[PDB]
């Protein structure tokens, strides 16, 4: 009468951690802190 399911293992609780672990490398970029941002209204910006 051990931990096998049909031999009494069905009485154990189920322990789960709901928090999701993200397994993607991602990428860190620094252009946006230096580059110049302008607001567009149409589809083309002219200078």
């Amino acid at each position: 009468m051990g931990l096998t399911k049909a031999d009494g293992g069905y009485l154990v609780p189920f322990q789960l951690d709901p928090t999701v672990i993200i397994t993607s490398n991602g990428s860190l970029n620094d252009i946006r802190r230096f580059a110049r941002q302008v607001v567009a209204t149409g589809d083309v910006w002219h200078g």
């Binding site: 051990g2 931990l3 009494g8 293992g9």
Partner: protein, 49 residues
Amino acid sequence: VSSAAVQWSWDAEFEEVSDDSPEFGQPEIPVKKAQGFVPISIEALQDEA
């Protein structure tokens, strides 16, 4: 101990009586035992509820 009654009789005057000694018996009751076993792992006792 088990026994029965004494068998009388309707007799006449000046007549011998009949031997009416009863008999006995000893009922006997032996005593017996029953069993049951359940083995369990150490892990199950401290994990299962």
